[PDB]
Design an enzyme around this catalytic site. Structure first.
Site, short mmCIF file in Angstrom:
data_model
loop_
_atom_site.label_atom_id
_atom_site.label_comp_id
_atom_site.label_asym_id
_atom_site.label_seq_id
_atom_site.Cartn_x
_atom_site.Cartn_y
_atom_site.Cartn_z
N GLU A 13 -77.74 84.97 -48.77
CA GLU A 13 -78.98 84.01 -48.87
C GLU A 13 -78.38 82.79 -49.30
O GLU A 13 -78.39 82.68 -50.48
CB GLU A 13 -80.06 84.44 -49.25
CG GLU A 13 -80.86 85.50 -48.55
CD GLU A 13 -81.61 85.09 -47.43
OE1 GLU A 13 -81.61 83.80 -47.24
OE2 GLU A 13 -82.21 85.99 -46.43
N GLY A 14 -78.23 81.71 -48.47
CA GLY A 14 -77.62 80.52 -48.85
C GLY A 14 -78.56 79.53 -49.21
O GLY A 14 -79.81 79.89 -49.08
N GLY A 17 -80.65 78.86 -46.08
CA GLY A 17 -80.98 79.95 -45.16
C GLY A 17 -79.81 80.89 -45.35
O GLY A 17 -79.01 80.84 -46.02
N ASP A 122 -75.33 69.20 -55.34
CA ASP A 122 -75.80 70.72 -55.62
C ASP A 122 -74.55 71.43 -55.71
O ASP A 122 -74.51 72.69 -55.44
CB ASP A 122 -76.64 71.34 -54.73
CG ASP A 122 -77.12 72.79 -55.33
OD1 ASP A 122 -77.33 72.78 -56.42
OD2 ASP A 122 -77.55 73.60 -54.62
N1 LIG Z 1 -67.98 82.91 -47.32
C1 LIG Z 1 -68.30 81.93 -46.92
N2 LIG Z 1 -69.50 81.53 -47.78
C2 LIG Z 1 -70.06 80.40 -47.54
O1 LIG Z 1 -71.27 79.82 -48.07
C3 LIG Z 1 -72.11 80.64 -48.50
C4 LIG Z 1 -72.33 81.89 -48.13
C5 LIG Z 1 -73.70 82.59 -48.87
C6 LIG Z 1 -74.21 81.90 -49.69
C7 LIG Z 1 -73.72 80.68 -50.44
C8 LIG Z 1 -74.46 80.23 -51.55
C9 LIG Z 1 -75.28 78.90 -51.37
O2 LIG Z 1 -75.33 78.32 -50.31
O3 LIG Z 1 -76.19 78.79 -52.21
C10 LIG Z 1 -72.82 80.01 -49.66
C11 LIG Z 1 -69.24 79.25 -46.73
N3 LIG Z 1 -69.54 78.20 -46.57
C12 LIG Z 1 -68.37 77.98 -45.88
N4 LIG Z 1 -67.48 78.83 -45.61
C13 LIG Z 1 -67.96 79.81 -45.97
N5 LIG Z 1 -67.58 81.17 -46.27
#
Ligand SMILES: Nc1nc(Oc2cccc(CC(=O)O)c2)c2nc[nH]c2n1
Length: 291
Positions: A13-14, A17, A122
């Site tokens: 969960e980013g 979303g 952030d």
């Molecule tokens: N493995 C991975 N994960 C990513 O982002 C995440 C994935 C999940 C959660 C979050 C945390 C947040 O958003 O707070 C970031 C990527 N972004 C670009 N490439 C990526 N690869």
């Protein structure tokens, strides 16, 4: 099921979303696919401009997909974030030469973005991504402005890396907010503990004040007029960095102190930080990644 992707798997969960690990159906590549949790046309255009940015220390934004009235961002996938790497490294610590390499690289990525008039707003260990070749990269540059003070996530948002001007209710973001966050991450890599692990906007501000001293008009002209400043805030004296981030050396503590000045205008720039004596002997070591 997805019309353009195969083997879609949830990563987590980013901030905006759910984030999936997904395999492009036409090409077979594996990407990070971010579904933006809407209830924003301006947000397309602006984010689409971020597709043009390309730096070794920025996670590439490959595409912006707007279909079926849903919005997705496609980024270059990386296998581990800095939070998981710090957790995996907790017994030993991240070696100093690697901490220095990662900080250097992160400063290069911020200097690039800031020179292109893009802020993060952030930064946090969960959007700093690492690979097996010793690189570290910043993900999600420019999204906060394009989204914007607003929360799209279901998870507890972390406040630990938020600059004090943000916490004091200033609605004017500058490059300095990213230097603050990076300073907090630097300190966490060195000590193996978060610097300011606040659980609320006031606990976050009071943790900062108890370490750095309560700010005043001498160190931060204008602070007492920030929107959420209260004259009733306790007056803590400021502790020395030597107690805060041991055993970091004189050079590292000097740089960190410049990253953590209260007044955003006084905070070192990314470009100036790259010239600091701390980076005289910087190298690019190979990390030990368990995937
Ligand atoms: N493995 C991975 N994960 C990513 O982002 C995440 C994935 C999940 C959660 C979050 C945390 C947040 O958003 O707070 C970031 C990527 N972004 C670009 N490439 C990526 N690869």
């Amino acid at each position: 099921f997805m019309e353009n992707f195969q083997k879609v798997e949830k990563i987590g969960e980013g901030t905006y979303g759910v984030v999936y690990k997904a395999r492009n159906k036409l090409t077979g590549e594996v990407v990070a696919l971010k579904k933006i949790r809407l209830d924003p046309s301006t947000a397309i255009r602006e984010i689409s401009l971020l597709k043009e940015l390309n730096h070794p220390n920025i996670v590439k934004l490959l595409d912006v997909i707007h279909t079926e009235n849903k919005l997705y961002l496609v980024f270059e996938f990386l296998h581990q974030d800095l939070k998981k790497f710090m957790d995996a490294s907790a017994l030993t610590g991240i070696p100093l030469p690697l901490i220095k390499s990662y900080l250097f690289q992160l400063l290069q990525g911020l200097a690039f973005c800031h020179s292109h008039r893009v802020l993060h707003r952030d930064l946090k260990p969960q959007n700093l991504l690492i690979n097996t070749e010793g690189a570290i990269k910043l993900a999600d540059f420019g999204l906060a402005r394009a989204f914007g003070v607003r929360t799209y996530t279901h998870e507890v948002v972390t406040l630990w890396y938020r600059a004090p001007e943000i916490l004091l209710g200033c609605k004017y973001y500058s490059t300095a907010v990213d230097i603050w966050s990076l300073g907090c991450i630097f300190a966490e890599m060195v000590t193996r503990r978060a610097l300011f692990p606040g659980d609320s906007e006031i606990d976050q501000l009071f943790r900062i004040f108890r370490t750095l001293g309560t700010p005043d008009e001498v160190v931060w002209p204008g602070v007492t007029s920030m929107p959420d400043y209260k004259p009733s805030f306790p007056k803590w004296a400021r502790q020395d960095f030597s107690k805060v981030v041991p055993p970091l050396d004189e050079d590292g503590r000097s740089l960190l102190s410049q990253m953590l000045h209260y007044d955003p205008n006084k905070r070192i720039s990314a470009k100036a930080a790259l010239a600091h004596p701390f980076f005289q002997d910087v190298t690019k070591p190979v990390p030990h990644l368990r995937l």
